[PDB]
């Protein structure tokens, strides 16, 4: 028996008592040391983004301590401090041999926590294939910084990776929530010169400057496109990373990218039948404006590499954490903080 | 002075008298030996796709004989038989240094004929930068086959290039007009195993089989997405090449491509404000289904390489030519042939 | 359980061993057709991979599944399968890096007749059946299918590494069974002119069959000068090394134009150094990329290569010049590869 | 007429006066504001690296003021302060259409200054195709910083580009001269986590730490290869950038790069016939260790993008400047500084 903060049904959350998970021969049981709520947890409960769920523990961002391992786990022992990726895919599928573990076994099936499997907002959680989906966490990295790696860092950096940024290129980041702020840092880690951040909330404008943004575009001062087309003197941006906004942010991205550039989306679109690609500004189909959109990489290797970027001081994700709470109870308060969305909020963390 | 079949205004075409073009120091004057009409010309005249034009000679697909050269032209001399690419870009721009001559000087600015400059449907036409935008035509290649290289072959092959086909991958070609038929041949030249061609006219289904299609999906037997999902046993295709159809064929392509696959568009969309990307079937933004759309490569090097594939018997584009006419007078007949679209038409050629 | 094994540096014979048992994810396969390799000769008679005692040889087999572990989901006893020469462990860091050929160590993806009993036995063990087995359609004859595990995937991999562009000129150095598959692979990547370098009339004939447009005999003079004359001093866009001594590396660099690629899939078994010509490599700055890689393995690679045979994009049966029947002839076919007679490309031993 | 510091013949340098160059219609005449000597200048004179030259003005690294432009120059007028790339290629060749302007018209033919054309160590110098080979220099960037862009920065960054660094990868930089220090900075701009710099001189070891080096490997303390394998616990590096050393530094790089990694050379090798690739540590041809080696990119776009990296404070090249001189007289003394390489020297600059 263990307790966990779960989604009871649509529009309903509460604490439930559940059977403590048991590990298979290749699995591990981890208890959380620090968790953070996601905008997907809000979208899952109150908007049915993944369908109906009943008594499903929420959360997919956790650093924890290994409690038990299966008989065939060889690299992780009880007591180990580990960083747990948000996506813990099955590594023995055809999609992995194609190079897309994010979709191992189905579209976005690499993401299991709080989807097809109880999330991390519990006293314990299950990790499948520990040797492939766990990374050792150095003590030198504080917990609140490390818990930004499972999703926030790997998603934002993936946007910069998908953008195929060349050295000195001009990159626009549309949306500067916690994911967008990691896209700014990621663009700087891909050699971007000028980085134009698009957002309004002062807490995020300040963090965007910290992570490398050279320009701030407020949608209040006029259309994003015009602002960006003037900042670049009609040349456009080499790449645009979509990290937030409505479906029509796709149209904005296509309009600001020069012919031959890339639109890299890592934002979750939860409404509309269509994401609009403007026919004229996409060259009527022929502008060579590549559109990409991908779930964040997970697994052990991805986490180890992002841990090294924190360890060797190439990025400090702790500026994303605006709220830290203590105690298991405060998972509810941090979750509700993600629904209610103050103005000073980037990301909350609950330390256990 | 000379004559040419021109667009007089929206909806009106006819023969006009123009001053004979003179070459700049790097340019060449070519008289046509063989011309082909396009589907774009229909759209340009009767739908105002590129705005308003007055006395603009039409056509952009020609093989011809060099008549005069500029004072600095070094590899082409009057009398030379040349293949003229549909895209003749200015090669001294920043977009060329970025690797996108198709947009040298602006979006799709690499396409000049019958756009910003008099087309090839005249007794002569102007070719800018002869040394960079002309390719010698071997005697061994018949004219009607060679005039399928300037646009049809380079566009269809470009769709196969953009698709990032892996050896043995399953490729769908959506639309089997002349561009789609060259996309089938291009997919076969990229090592595709199974190639599923989607089209209905029997003349195109037969040419699709000839160029490498292993399956024919007729809209008759049900929705394309269910037919392809049945052929691939729920797996989908590794890549889909869009070579024709309405804006909503973009939705079809995304729905049939595996997560992680590529949608490669080389079709021109002339209607609607938006090209629809299905939000659900695009993984809500995270299915890793890359969408590309690009104008065909032009210039000398692209033509030389495509000429070599014809010379070395890797593709024979002559099966695309279903109508051959022999007079300058008959340029109008071939032009109207692309407007009326009879069911026996793939591409017409006028030999001069 | 009998098997043709390596007794030591120069001694081979049929041996009696314990029949292998499958782990929960493994399968036991009996061979239907096997082929001997040049690497087995190098292993037995030259101690290239060290000393081994009672190790069954061979790594190229198509067979019938006899038993599977309790967790195999896609393969049952009776299934006729193609077994890749490389059967890697799919749960390592190198797989997450995208290099299963080196999963667990350099070339560790190759286990048969190296770290594990080969296929020259009444049974052999396949690790991770669901990831390392491909169903073989009834339509493909056995001698054709047994060219897929190594010959086809290696030769095609050379063409893949060469980064061939449509219409490019490709040189293939060496037209043994791997080189002839490199010729076919180059033709599957859209190569225009294909220059094959080889001597034996049986192999020159197969090179023409697989797409070679030019044949270079080292007897009519040096390669380097013959190819420079064929290309009128331009060189080739890519060179695939599929045979020869260490100094063939120098030949390849000399014939590729600046910016081209040298793709090696040949195994070099003598010398401390493979020579890169300093002058013809631009003193380090000619942009002539050099690649060299072990063939891909696993289920997905075999399924895709099976589709190229099934859909008649390549027919490897022209590689099979001698077919033997019965277990007896494994020794005869194996010994045939120590001093390859001049009409031999690849031999096949059919067992059932 | 004008003066320039020239190479008279092998080993002898001196002042000569020559006809002042005149611009073609697309060219510009530039007078230097700041110059720097190169290791290529020493090698060219004292080792005959590029053959025999007589009265050839040396130097290829300069920022300057445009003095006159041809009738067709559109973006540069007399008085403009410009950054002049070391490589000023002819942009209308087939190699440009292949994407390798560094070799436009022949191997390394993109480099003209102090090679096929008088260098920058004169009162004036000629720049071909000003609109394609000149970049405006903002007043905000000091001259000694800007003169590290034409060669030092673009070469070092190109080493990082060729290395295909993934986010968090471990990179080794072999040689920490001014190019190697820019390779260190470049690796940090591609998201390298751990960067291992190999060098001895304290002025360069300290600059390497400043540019992102996390480890310094001294050739004193034992073999580099054994030293680097110890730092990485036998794993090796994901990529190695060669920026100096003997021919067998190529052997060092291959030994320290893990299977699947990349060896990227940007060092100029001036002695020996062969660069040795170790057969065993190259997987006997199959270790997937890609070897690249390329001349630095030039042209306007490359300079504009690196100017942006300086302008937006992503890299500061000024600590490469250890000696500053004032006067055209002092070019001789700075050139001699690169001959008699003191020890506190990284790069000298002559401000005019």
UniProtKB/Swiss-Prot annotation, chains A, B, D:
Catalytic activity: propan-2-ol + NADP(+) = acetone + NADPH + H(+)
Chain positions recorded as NADP(+) binding sites: 176-179, 199-201, 219, 266-268, 341
GO MF entries: isopropanol dehydrogenase (NADP+) activity; zinc ion binding
Enzyme Commission number(s): 1.1.1.80
Positions bound to Zn(2+): 38, 60, 151
Highest taxon, organism lineage: Bacteria
Keyword Oxidoreductase: yes
Keywords of this entry: Metal-binding, NADP, Oxidoreductase, Zinc
Alphabetical list of InterPro entries matching this protein: ADH-like_C, ADH-like_N, ADH_Zn_CS, GroES-like_sf, NAD(P)-bd_dom_sf, PKS_ER
Comment on bound cofactor: Binds 1 zinc ion per subunit.
Gene3D superfamilies to which the protein is assigned, alphabetical: Medium-chain alcohol dehydrogenases, catalytic domain (3.90.180.10), NAD(P)-binding Rossmann-like Domain (3.40.50.720)
Cofactor(s) in the UniProt record: Zn(2+)
Assembly with partners or alone: Homotetramer.
Function text: Alcohol dehydrogenase with a preference for medium chain secondary alcohols, such as 2-butanol and isopropanol. Has very low activity with primary alcohols, such as ethanol. Under physiological conditions, the enzyme reduces aldehydes and 2-ketones to produce secondary alcohols. Is also active with acetaldehyde and propionaldehyde.
Family: Belongs to the zinc-containing alcohol dehydrogenase family.
Protein name (database record): NADP-dependent isopropanol dehydrogenase
The species this protein was found in: Thermoanaerobacter brockii (Thermoanaerobium brockii)
Swiss-Prot record, chain C:
EC number: 1.1.1.80
Cofactor descriptive note: Binds 1 zinc ion per subunit.
Name of the coding gene: adh
Protein name per UniProt: NADP-dependent isopropanol dehydrogenase
Amino-acid positions noted as binding NADP(+) in the UniProt annotation, renumbered to this chain: 175-178, 198-200, 218, 265-267, 340
PANTHER family in the cross-refs: NADP-DEPENDENT ISOPROPANOL DEHYDROGENASE, ZINC-TYPE ALCOHOL DEHYDROGENASE-LIKE
Keywords carried by this UniProt record: Metal-binding, NADP, Oxidoreductase, Zinc
Keyword Lyase: no
PROSITE patterns reported for this sequence: ADH_ZINC
One Pfam entry name: ADH_N
UniProt binding sites for Zn(2+): 37, 59, 150
GO-annotated molecular function: isopropanol dehydrogenase (NADP+) activity; zinc ion binding
Catalysed conversion reaction: propan-2-ol + NADP(+) = acetone + NADPH + H(+)
Organism of this sequence: Thermoanaerobacter brockii (Thermoanaerobium brockii)
Cofactor(s) the protein requires to work: Zn(2+)
Known role: Alcohol dehydrogenase with a preference for medium chain secondary alcohols, such as 2-butanol and isopropanol. Has very low activity with primary alcohols, such as ethanol. Under physiological conditions, the enzyme reduces aldehydes and 2-ketones to produce secondary alcohols. Is also active with acetaldehyde and propionaldehyde.
Complex and partners: Homotetramer.
Family: Belongs to the zinc-containing alcohol dehydrogenase family.
């Amino acid at each position: 028996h263990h307790k966990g903060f779960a989604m009871l049904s649509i529009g309903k959350v509460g604490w439930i008592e559940k059977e403590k998970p048991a590990p298979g021969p290749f699995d591990a049981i981890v208890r959380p040391l620090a968790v953070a709520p996601c905008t997907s947890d809000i979208t899952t409960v109150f908007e049915g983004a993944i369908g109906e769920r009943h008594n499903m523990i929420l959360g997919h961002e956790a650093v924890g301590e290994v409690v038990e391992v299966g008989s065939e786990v060889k690299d992780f022992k009880p007591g180990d401090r580990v960083v747990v990726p948000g996506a813990t895919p099955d590594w023995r599928t055809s999609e992995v041999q194609r190079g897309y573990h994010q979709h191992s076994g189905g579209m976005l099936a690499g993401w299991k926590f709080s989807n097809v499997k109880d999330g991390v907002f519990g006293e314990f959680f299950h990790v499948n294939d520990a040797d492939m989906n766990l990374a050792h966490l150095p003590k030198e990295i504080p917990l609140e910084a490390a818990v930004m790696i499972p999703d926030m860092m790997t998603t934002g950096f993936h946007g910069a990776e998908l953008a195929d940024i060349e050295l000195g290129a001009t990159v626009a980041v549309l949306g500067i929530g916690p994911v967008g702020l990691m896209a700014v840092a990621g663009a700087k880690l891909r050699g971007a010169g000028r980085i134009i951040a698009v957002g309004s909330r002062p807490v995020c404008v300040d963090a965007a400057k910290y992570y490398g943004a050279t320009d701030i575009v407020n949608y209040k001062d006029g259309p994003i496109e015009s602002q960006i087309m003037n900042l670049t003197e009609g040349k456009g941006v080499d790449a645009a990373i979509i990290a937030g906004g409505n479906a029509d942010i796709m149209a904005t991205a296509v309009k600001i990218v020069k012919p031959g550039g890339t639109i890299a989306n890592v934002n979750y679109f939860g409404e509309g039948e269509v994401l609009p690609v403007p026919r004229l500004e996409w060259g009527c189909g022929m502008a060579h404006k590549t559109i990409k959109g991908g779930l964040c990489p997970g697994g052990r290797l991805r986490m180890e590499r992002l841990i090294d970027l924190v360890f060797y001081k190439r990025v400090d994700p702790s500026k994303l954490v605006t709220h830290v709470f203590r105690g298991f109870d405060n998972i509810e308060k941090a979750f509700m903080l993600m629904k209610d969305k103050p103005k000073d909020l980037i990301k909350p963390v609950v330390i256990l």
